[PDB]
Symmetry: C3
Subunit: 90 residues, 3 copies
């Protein structure tokens, strides 16, 4: 019984984001080239996946947090985490 | 018990694919910039991971579906899912 | 019930790396355009995630291996796997 992680990165420094699902909560650790620090993302979930992409210099991150059969998409687009349009129907 | 997902994205719109393993079946949800829809991928698996890459305008997707100690690679290269040559000795 | 995998890819060939967590061991399978082979990475873990990036033609890989609440980061930067600076407080 171990925590479950997901990772993404962008750029050439690079920036790295590691999401950890632990006891029903997902938290975020961040690297921007200097050191690791705790990120703003903190949402419920037993399982996590992530993907990201750049548009110019702007990073866009999508975190897929799952509890039971419900997957919630969380969006970072430069100004805070927001709930995305993703639905599944599991 | 929660479902397990894997996500990938390409391009700048972007396109996103989210794979969900649920009770031994993997299904696929797709975003191409307008809304989410159900993808063609549907294969057995209790665990899924994914990676993708572009060569010019051509997208390639590799989905690794596992049941027990067996991992099957599924390939998208523009015209249907096929599977791949991947083998493991788990 | 099943093994757990993580995948990454880079370049246009492409190179693919698939990490498998199985009974407390994470192992690595590699594709560089010709066939699959077993990689050098072999470390303890019940869960694995991965990310990678290019700096020019040089590939960098980060593998996040977790046991219990401890996540260890493993780094490939061209010349062997080394433990990274990642820490979490799970
Ligand atoms: Zn359960
Ligand atoms: Zn191709």
């Amino acid at each position: 019984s171990s925590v479950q992680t997901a990772a993404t990165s962008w750029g050439t420094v690079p920036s790295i984001r590691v999401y950890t699902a632990n006891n029903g909560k997902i938290t975020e650790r961040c690297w921007d080239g200097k050191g690791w620090y705790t990120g703003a993302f903190n949402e419920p979930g037993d399982n996590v996946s992530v993907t990201s992409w750049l548009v110019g210099s702007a990073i866009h991150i999508r975190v897929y947090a799952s509890t039971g059969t419900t997957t919630t998409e969380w969006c970072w687009d430069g100004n805070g985490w927001t709930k995305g349009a993703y639905t599944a129907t599991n």
